Each structure stands twice: as C-alpha cells, then as structure tokens.
Design an enzyme around this catalytic site. Structure first.
Site, PDB file in Angstrom:
ATOM      1  N   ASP B  91       1.080  -1.087  -0.169  1.00 49.82           N
ATOM      2  CA  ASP B  91       0.040   0.004   0.087  1.00 49.82           C
ATOM      3  C   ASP B  91       0.938   1.196   0.034  1.00 49.82           C
ATOM      4  O   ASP B  91       1.838   1.344   1.171  1.00 49.82           O
ATOM      5  CB  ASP B  91      -0.926   0.026   1.211  1.00 49.82           C
ATOM      6  CG  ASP B  91      -1.698   1.261   1.415  1.00 49.82           C
ATOM      7  OD1 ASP B  91      -1.568   2.338   1.014  1.00 49.82           O
ATOM      8  OD2 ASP B  91      -2.573   1.133   2.187  1.00 49.82           O
ATOM      9  N   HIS B 249      12.505  15.346  18.101  1.00 48.32           N
ATOM     10  CA  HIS B 249      13.144  16.639  18.363  1.00 48.32           C
ATOM     11  C   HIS B 249      14.772  16.238  18.530  1.00 48.32           C
ATOM     12  O   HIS B 249      15.178  15.322  18.638  1.00 48.32           O
ATOM     13  CB  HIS B 249      13.017  16.563  19.974  1.00 48.32           C
ATOM     14  CG  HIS B 249      13.555  17.743  20.735  1.00 48.32           C
ATOM     15  ND1 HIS B 249      13.179  18.828  20.895  1.00 48.32           N
ATOM     16  CD2 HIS B 249      14.827  17.829  21.350  1.00 48.32           C
ATOM     17  CE1 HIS B 249      14.164  19.570  21.419  1.00 48.32           C
ATOM     18  NE2 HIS B 249      14.924  18.987  21.805  1.00 48.32           N
TER      19      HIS B 249
HETATM   20 CU   LIG Z   1      14.056  17.844  25.495  1.00 49.32          CU
HETATM   21 CU   LIG Z   2      -1.658   3.053   5.408  1.00 49.45          CU
END
Ligand SMILES: [Cu+2]
Ligand SMILES: [Cu+2]
Ligand SMILES: [Cu+2]
Ligand SMILES: [Cu+2]
Ligand SMILES: [Cu+2]
Ligand SMILES: [Cu+2]
Lengths: 341, 341, 341
Positions: B91, B249
């Site tokens: 997919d 992050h």
């Molecule tokens: Cu942090």
């Molecule tokens: Cu999917």
C-alpha cells in the site's frame, strides 16, 4: 572575546504567574541573568494527599517561566545545593549546541555552573534536566521541567502585520506523574527519590500516568487559586509538557490566536476549540474574554482532566452578554402534549 | 495504451542512507523502476539481545526510502520468495486507487507482482504491507513499512518562493514493537512469525509498545553508527511512523523548516523545537548545523527515547561558536557567601 | 431585548448522513431551531454482539451533525425524558460562555431546557454532555457527543480566494469505549448505566479503550452500510473525537483540502496522507474521488482500525484510470532466472 552588553538580573516568580517584562521593547540586546536552584523534596500531588518524591527547579512544578527577547543572551546560574542527593543539569530547547546546555551544566550536590545561550529563536520553549540515559525521563517526570519565552522585540503579531498585546499572562505547566501502587492498589510512599526509582521506572515503562496535573498537583489552579481575568482582557496562556502530549481547551471559550507548536516566526491559527501540545514542547494561546463566570481549562482527554488532575479554573468578572448566549427557558417539566421519540 | 516514457532502474540502499537522486531536475517524467523483496526473519531489537520474528521489505526495518519526482511513474516489482510463510502486498500512501496498491499486489510465497502508480502528490509518504483484516496491523508492526519521497521537479522550497537544498539526507523509520513476556516478565522467543502471532496480538490490543526503535533496534544509530554531519550543512531528516504517533526532537538543535504532515504543497513551519509525526505518515525537517558535537535525535516521550529504544545520535564536526553558547563558569563549589532558598 | 429574526426549524438526521442545508447562502441571520432528546439505552458495539450501557443524544453515537451559518443563532431544546436515570446537559465548543452552555442546561429526568448561542466562530466543533466532575468523562465516553458545523455564509474556500463546494457530506463520529472484563477476559454486561459505572471508571483510568468505533459500533459503516460516492465527486468528511486523539486516513485516497484543527478561518492543508483530530475537537477533509472501488477510512493506528473497530468503507462507482495506477503484471511465479537476495 568578552561580551560587552548591559546586564539585567531577573527575579523569577512561581508559576502560574510570570516575572515582570516588556512585550515590545526598544532596548537593545542585554545579558539577562537568571538563577535556578534545584530542590529535591516530597510534595503533595492530589486531593487525597498522595505524596511524591519530586525534583524541581526553584521548588515548583513547573519550574518558573523565563521571559527574554530575540537577540538577548541568557546567562543562567544553575545551583545544586548539597542537601540534594543527585547530579542535575539543564537543557534549553531555545538554545543551540551541547544538547541544549545539558552537556555543559552537569553539577553534583554542592556545585553550581553558569551557562550563557543566545536567544536566536522566538517562541515558547521547554527547559528540563537531562543527566544522561534513563535518568533523563526520570528527572523530567519527577518535575524537573519549565519553559522560556523569547519574544520578538516588537512583541507578538498575528502573522498578517497586526500587533497583538496581552493584558495578562499565565504559565500552565502540565506534568505526567508515575506513582507506584501496592498490591491493594494504594499509592506507595518513599523516603527518598532513589528509593522510589526502581518501582517508578516500572510504572513509567507502561507509559500510562497515574496523575496528570497543572502547577504540580490536582486542584492547584481551582478554588481559591483559580486564575483571575476580566471581560475584555486579552490573556496569553502558555502551556508546556516536557514528556507527553496534551490537548488544551478553554471550556466556554476558544483560542483566538494559537501557536500550538509554540514558535512566533509562524502565524498563529485562529478560532480554535482545542489545540495540541506535542510532548517536549510549549505552545501558547491568546483569548479575549467575552463573558464573565467560571471557565475550566483542561486537557481534553476528559478522563485526564476530571479523574487524573488536569483541570484549572478561570474566574472572570464582568457583565453577561445575552446576545452571545442566553437561557431562553429555564429547566421545566416536559410538556404533557410533547412527543420526543 | 502503452506508456512511452524513458525507464530508469533505481538501486535501493539500506536506511538510514538514501539512494542517489537529484533534488531539482530538468528531466521530464520517467518510469522509475524499483524492486522490493519481502524477507521474513528473526532479528535482534535491543541491547540485551531480545529477538523478534520480523517481516521486512528488503531485509531492513524500515524498508528503504524510494525517491522520485512529481509526475514520474513508479513501477514496483514486489517479490515474495518461497522461503517466506505468509502472503504479502504493498500500500503506497503516495498512490491513488486500489487501497494504495494493496488490492493489486497480494502475492503468495513463490510469486511476484508489478504495480505502477503515478506520483501525482508531493511529499514524503508511508508505504506498508496490508494483507487484510487483522493481518494489516500485524504485518506493519512486524516491520513491513517504509517511505517514499516525491520531490517537486524544482526541488524543495520554503513556501515563500525561496529554494531550499539539502547537503545530506537521512531516513529515520520509527517502529513500535509488541513483544510478548512470560509470567516472570522476560521477553518470549518464537520459531516462526505464525507461532508468535496469538501472543503478539494480545500485546498489540493493549496499544502499549514494548520497544520503540529507529532503524529496527535500540542503539541502531548510536555509537559507531551515529549519523555524521558538519557545521554549515543543511540536513534533511525524513521521519516515518506507519502505526503510531511520534514527536521528533533534535537535542541541541531545531527544525529550521518542518513539514510535520510531510507534504511539500504546504509551506513548512519555521524554528520548531519538537514536531509531530501522526501515525500512518511521514514528515521531514531541514536543519543547518551551527555547532559541532553529539546531538541526540529522539521522540520526545523521553521514556520512549531513553528506556524503550528511540534515540539516534548525530556526530557533527566543526568549530564551536561561543557566541551561540558558552560555559561562562565551569562547575565549582557553591560560594560560602551564597544564600539559595 | 427580544431577538427579532426569522426562525427556521431543522429536522436532524442520524449520522453518518446530514440534514439538508445550503453551503453558500444569501439569507441573512436566522434563529435555527434544533431539538435533542437524551436516550440512555443498551447498545451493541461489536461484531461478537458485546452490549454496552450507552447514553446518547437522539439515540445515536455520535449525536447528529447540526449545520448553521456564521451569524446565525442556534436555539437548542434539550429534553431529558423521565425514562432516563441521570441528569444531563450540553456543552457546545462552538459557543461562548457558561462552559459552552453546560452551566445553563443541567436537566433532571422529566425536564427540558432551551439554550440559544450565537454562531460567531466558523468550523466544525464538538458538542457533548458535561454534568460535572467525574460525570463529565463518563457521559462523553458513554456516547454523549456529536458535532456542529458553522459554515461561512459564502461556503467553504481554499484560503486563497477560491470557492470549494462538496457534492456529498458524511459525518464520522469516533468513539473510544471502556468496557469492563471479568477474570476470564470476557466483556461484562450490566442492567443499567449506574451499575456499570464503578467497573467502567477503573477501565477509563488506565486510558486504553477496549473499542474504538465509528457510528457507534465495529462494522457500522462497512458491508451494506458502506458510504457511497462516485468518481469526480468532492466529498466532505467531518470527523470528531470528543475525548481522545485520532489520525484519519482514506486508504487509496488523500485529503485534498484538510482543516485538521477544524476551523474555516484557517486555510486548509493540501494533499495530506493522514491527518490528526485532537481529542476534544472536530476536523474536516475534502477529497475528489479519482478511482472507483472500495476505500477503507481508518484511524491509522492500524491496531485500532482492524482489531478495535475503527474502519469504515466507501464504495465508489465509476471507471478505473490506468494512468493513475495499473497492475502491469498480475501475480506470477518468480522467474527461475531471478536472484532476489
Ligand atoms: Cu528536551
Ligand atoms: Cu496505510
Ligand atoms: Cu535533575
Ligand atoms: Cu506482509
Ligand atoms: Cu449526560
Ligand atoms: Cu469539551
């Protein structure tokens, strides 16, 4: 090469309040001096009196909000008194280099350190302790996190060249806590953070908090410590979460202007019902109050809000506006000639 | 009606690296030919040596990054060798129709299939196996997912008519894993994926991973396999998560330009601390390194990052910039004339 | 001061359908009159026949979609028939003041109340019951939530001065449910909502749903109740989640225009693979179908989608476009002269 700028010492205040500052400023860059003192201590975290072995900056969960302007330097004295048991440090998500400052600030009990970072990025940002390894999440979820706001020198704007100014500011630090239970389901108490660690890590590993609180405890910002405002005031609500997502909502209000990723180089979104603070970030919402009364400020996992601690109140003074909302008919018995199927 | 375009065969490379490609191109549309070979195999997933019955595209978690340009056709040969035990398919979230191609690519062991999809949508996108029913999540969380990048023909831009160019690209595939434990809490081993299924489904149903890893295992991208960069380089970090949210992050850095929903028709956000990859998507962040040293790249659920496997490192060469950050005073004993209460 | 506007009574319809309305209108502001009748009742929630003590607006999970225009007044008659056991109320996230109306609408069984709120904020918004305290999450996760759409008077636009018009609209309300299990793992049945409460609250506290469903039950929008469309139709999909995050994805499609925070004063994002509905909000996506066939509409935690109930289907009529996608070679035995290592 010595940095030859004016110095300004800032006295921090306990959340949810914020030290005095200017929004727009024509002052040039300064070296803004802050002090943070680590305090390990037992704290009460819920309305039944559960205690917890907390670790804090400046004695509060969250740590205090620091406010500077773009281009300032931030010189932080981090102090780890010898009554503490653990090494600590500080990582500013606002700062560039050395793991946010963590790699330059590791101090044993009885030591202090001085870090300077240039405020090159505007927004609200998390700061947190991060000693290394598994100590990183443990120190953060024990309370060692706060936020810093780096304002543009011209103050906030709507991203379409219009100035925005707040009348009031509050800092809402949200804390996920992981408190061990005994075989009967009761919360366990410990005599030190070290003694709590092994049992706490087991709860942390299952990623489900036992408590989710604002300002360090269930009910901290309700009752007599409700947040005050007045009809017509534009209020900035800074929200941080250093470890886990949140979805703030002001019940009976909106976010007029919301920086949910928290960074003032991006235009805010308008007219939100609920916004999203990704774990490891701070965001901010402005709202101009239009109606008096009690407002509840929640994370809109209502289970978290009502049953794990994560509700604050605003008490707003002013005159009710029946054009915006009115009770057309008070509760009354259903008319006998009604259907309703 | 035969499609009469030039054909180009691409040799895929193992993540976190990326096959050679052009950012901006003046080539017209091509049929870009890729081959993916399913491999079911036991893999090591953590630093204690826990094994896992994995299912992969091309032998890796994540599957390799495919890179094409807007308007190209992508012709994928999917191969399911007869040493595998399960049917598989693919997919593409980049593709239009037939469940992303899954409804045209179901192959038994000993079969292959050829799918072509037009790259009409720019961005980074997940691809994954999705055989049907409960097999869909099981194949994905067993490792059967990767990503594809569809670049604009003019390369990236900032959404304000300025070209952005990366010096380096890395693909970070994040994987949530669900490993059964025995009564004593130890991870269970199995001799086949089928034998692991019933116990694994029970863990999956509680929606809490036992491991959250980058490049298929805890520590994959630390130590000697840290990601290299240099001060001044603009680095594109593509992040995918096929089943569960993440909050990337870069510790000590920022996202200079971030497409957290991953789609280059939208302008990126600027100066983020932490961004959000919704489960079932890929996103991307550019960052220009400004400081040398070690950076940790995490999901900022720090419990996930430090204790469940989800930390990578960058090792960045260059010269330290003391204007951006400096240690004003190294750790020292707290002065006897200090207060600190 | 009496409000002297024309009145229009709206007949609500059961989700996922939507009452008839105009997109763009040159009518001025009206008082739009709606009635919602609370119904507490046992409902079937999964394909194995598990029952659940539900609490609903108008007998459905979700409650029906209300549609008005910016500047309209919305006058809601909330009815709590005396066959119900609990007090109820209603909080509109679209409304300003009195906790969204909850503080003006608390009614005992045998009572009704009439609330008017001005539709000053455009978007899709959650409405939900919120009686107070721990009853707030319990009523919401028992089914007492729906949504309201406040359209601009000129209809939708792309945020770049181009009108957008839908051919069809569907409302997908997603519900997290918390069903107790006995010692053997079987779902428990109860004779009343009150009798279910204590055991249900224990499941709620661990924040992991047992079921995540669209239109109130697993399989509600599959099989004969699949959602119909045609190639070329622009379909608006409104998605709400009053308590918990979701990540919608149309398998084999995209979100052409997505307001994931749900508020039409913000430009939509383009070409998304997966979007994010923060718990306590509604969002909306437009998609123009380009291919016929079955599409699955999921939350892209695939465990939630396949194993906890959160899959809908579209059945789309029209002609297949082999330029966008084609099966170049059907499944075939791997050629003997192949390598594949
Ligand atoms: Cu942090
Ligand atoms: Cu999917
Ligand atoms: Cu610490
Ligand atoms: Cu597979
Ligand atoms: Cu209710
Ligand atoms: Cu609400």
């Amino acid at each position: 090469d010595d940095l030859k700028l004016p110095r300004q010492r800032v006295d921090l205040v306990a959340p949810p309040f914020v030290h005095v500052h200017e929004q727009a400023t024509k002052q040039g860059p300064k070296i803004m001096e802050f002090k943070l003192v680590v305090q390990e201590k037992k704290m009460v975290i819920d309305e039944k009196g559960t205690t917890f072995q907390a670790m804090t900056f400046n004695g509060s969960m969250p740590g205090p909000l620091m406010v500077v302007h773009e281009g300032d330097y931030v010189e932080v004295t981090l102090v780890n008194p010898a009554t503490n048991t653990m090494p600590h440090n500080i990582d500013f998500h606002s700062a560039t280099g050395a793991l946010g400052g963590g790699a330059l600030t590791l101090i044993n009990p009885g030591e202090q350190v001085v870090l300077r970072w240039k405020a090159t990025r505007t927004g609200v940002f998390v700061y947190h302790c991060a000693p290394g390894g598994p100590m990183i999440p443990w120190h953060v979820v024990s309370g060692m996190n706060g936020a810093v706001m780096v304002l543009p020198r011209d103050g906030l704007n709507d991203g379409h060249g219009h100035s925005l100014r707040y009348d009031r500011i509050y800092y809402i630090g949200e804390q996920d806590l992981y408190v061990p239970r005994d075989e009967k389901g009761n919360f366990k108490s410990y005599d030190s953070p070290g003694e709590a660690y092994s049992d706490t890590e087991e709860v942390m590993r299952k990623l489900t908090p036992t408590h989710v609180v604002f300002n360090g405890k269930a009910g901290a910002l309700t009752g007599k410590n409700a947040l005050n405002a007045n009809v017509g005031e534009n209020v900035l609500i800074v929200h941080s979460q250093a470890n886990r997502d949140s979805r703030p909502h002001l019940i009976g209000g909106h976010g007029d202007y919301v920086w949910e990723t928290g960074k003032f180089s991006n235009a805010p979104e308008t007219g939100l019902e609920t916004w999203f603070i990704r774990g490891g970030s701070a965001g901010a919402a402005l709202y101009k109050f239009l109606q008096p009364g009690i407002y509840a400020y929640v994370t809109h996992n209502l289970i978290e809000a009502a049953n794990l601690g994560a509700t604050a109140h605003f008490k707003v003074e002013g005159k009710w506006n029946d054009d915006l909302m009115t009770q057309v008919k008070a509760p009354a018995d259903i008319p006998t000639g009604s259907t309703n199927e």
